[PDB]
From a paper:
The genome is replicated via a negative-sense RNA intermediate by 3Dpol, the viral RNA-dependent RNA polymerase (RdRP). These enzymes adopt a classical right hand architecture, with fingers, palm and thumb subdomains providing the correct geometrical arrangement of substrate molecules and metal ions at the polymerase active site for catalysis. Given its critical role in genome replication, 3Dpol is regarded as an attractive target for antiviral drugs.
We also solved the X-ray structure of the complex of CVB3 3Dpol with a second inhibitor of the GPC series, GPC-N143, at 2.7 Å resolution. This compound contains a central fluorophenyl ring instead of a chlorophenyl ring and displays similar antiviral activity as GPC-N114. As expected, the GPC-N143 binding site is identical to that of GPC-N114, establishing almost equivalent interactions. Thus, the crystallographic data demonstrate that GPC-N114 and GPC-N143 specifically interact with CVB3 3Dpol at the template channel without having major effects on the structure of the enzyme.
Numbering used by the authors: 1 to 467
């Protein structure tokens, strides 16, 4: 991804977008009770914690493109993964607006808390001013869509979230694109059935884990990945995606039976128009994290990518014995013979991708079930039911997250959520967690699940329904 053109908003007649200047994260009542090193990301330019230039850092992820056509490796990659998705019987038919906007099995209702984007955001108009979760009204939306169209600029927001000292210091805050409500809805219409199928079929056929529930899904993973594990990091995945990969994506959507017209939306993602604060810029390549389907699409591409590096480096490779699961840039994979991930990483670099050893590793080491992570979680078989596998989020991370809040009114929900995570570290660990929570008076006011109830409900969860 490369920033092609940049100018002042006033010159094209765009109003300044008034994004928030201060963080919503403050120290929680638990901030002194636990250790942690992370702090809210830098959102403004004058932040005294900065040890680099902010405007420069946030955009620097835009490292460049490699100009090329789809090669022989890409094609055969596309076909293999095409071969897989066909099994699923994805409907290329649009989805009925009601479903696309207000929910259905496999596609959550369009979130009414996020930005509506341009131009509504400029006009003080909020999502809730347009949609209602009570009347399922589409009369207003239809007016706005007809009024303002598709293909609108995107609004760029600095992601307000906890980060390490290194990234606060370097100003490497992450950017999120708010798509215009219309484009959101349109895309949901066009791809809703794809999304529905992806969320209902996490695993090695979709090669996706987007929408999954670790609690249930972890147990499936080792079953699906028989082989020697392959795992690894990207750096700036979304924004390094060159246009070539989008060509491949639309190439794959075409085999699923999407028309050229219907794939024009991939271009909307690839060559993008952004309204940042008082600037207005055009970007060629780069997945614009935050528009509709960016996770699914990031995964699908990744599915293409890895199969392409396998093919180019290991002539002889049989892909039908390959298995992968992506969540956007996060990949876990297996082959029956060892694979040198470093080879792949160097190969990938010729395509403008920065691959790295898994979990900020020193070298592309042996990947076991002991050290493998996915969505920041480890795997540990339950001591008692060995076919059951715990998703184990590290305590360090739970400790980090507990020390801040964006809204103390939700403490109960927040601490329960963290509870749902921590207990996989084991009873000793869980009881220390609970004691320290409880060493503050607010901690004593919270309804907190007992370990033994967490264990029971989990064991009980793999008793009903599918997967
Ligand atoms: N469309 C849409 C859409 C709407 C919102 N929103 O705020 O209402 C947010 C993300 C949206 O994109 C997706 C819509 C449906 C999907 F099945 C998947 C979408 O993309 C994601 C799916 C999953 C995740 N995730 O959980 O990380 C992030 C994204 C993103 N961006």
């Amino acid at each position: 991804g490369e920033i092609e053109f940049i100018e002042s908003s006033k010159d094209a007649g765009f109003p300044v977008i008034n994004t928030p200047s201060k963080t919503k994260l403050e120290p929680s009542v638990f901030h002194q009770v636990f250790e942690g090193n992370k702090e809210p990301a830098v959102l403004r330019s004058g932040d005294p914690r900065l040890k680099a230039n902010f405007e420069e850092a946030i955009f620097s992820k835009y490292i460049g493109n490699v100009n090329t056509h789809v090669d022989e490796y890409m094609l055969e990659a596309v076909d293999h993964y095409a071969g897989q998705l066909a099994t699923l019987d994805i409907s290329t038919e649009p989805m009925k607006l009601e479903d696309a906007v207000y929910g259905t099995e496999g596609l959550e209702a369009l979130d009414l808390t996020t930005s509506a984007g341009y131009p509504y955001v400029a006009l003080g108009i909020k999502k809730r001013d347009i949609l209602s979760k009570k009347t399922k009204d589409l009369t207003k939306l239809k007016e706005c869509m007809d009024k303002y169209g598709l293909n609108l600029p995107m609004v760029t927001y600095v992601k307000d979230e906890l980060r390490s000292i290194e990234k606060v210091a370097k100003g490497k805050s992450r950017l999120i694109e708010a798509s215009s409500l219309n484009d959101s809805v349109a895309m949901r219409q066009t791809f809703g059935n794809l999304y529905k199928t992806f969320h209902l079929n996490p695993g090695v056929v979709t090669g996706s884990a987007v929408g999954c529930d670790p609690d249930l899904f972890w147990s499936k993973i080792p079953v699906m990945l028989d082989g020697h594990l392959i795992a690894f990091d990207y750096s700036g995945y979304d924004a390094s995606l060159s246009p070539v990969w989008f060509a491949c994506l639309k190439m794959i959507l075409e085999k699923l039976g999407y028309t050229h017209k219907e794939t024009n939306y991939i271009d909307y993602l690839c060559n993008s128009h952004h309204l940042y604060r008082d600037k207005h810029y055009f970007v060629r390549g780069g997945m614009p994290s935050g528009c509709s389907g960016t996770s699914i699409f990031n995964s699908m591409i990744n599915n293409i990518i890895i199969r392409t590096l396998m093919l180019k480096v290991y002539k002889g490779i049989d892909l039908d014995q390959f298995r992968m699961i992506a969540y956007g840039d996060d990949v876990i994979a297996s082959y029956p013979w060892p694979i040198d991930a470093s080879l792949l990483a160097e190969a990938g670099k010729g395509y403008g991708l920065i691959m790295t050893p898994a979990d900020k590793g020193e070298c592309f080491n042996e990947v076991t079930w002991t050290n493998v992570t996915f969505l920041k979680r480890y795997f540990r078989a339950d001591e008692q039911y060995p076919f059951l596998v715990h998703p184990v989020m590290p305590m360090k991370d739970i400790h980090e997250s507990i020390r801040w809040t964006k809204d103390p009114k939700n403490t109960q929900d927040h601490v329960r959520s963290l509870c749902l995570l921590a207990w996989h570290n084991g009873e000793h660990e869980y009881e220390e967690f609970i004691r320290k929570i409880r060493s503050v008076p607010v901690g004593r006011c919270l309804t907190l699940p007992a370990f033994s109830t967490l264990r029971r409900k989990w064991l009980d969860s793999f008793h009903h329904h599918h997967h």
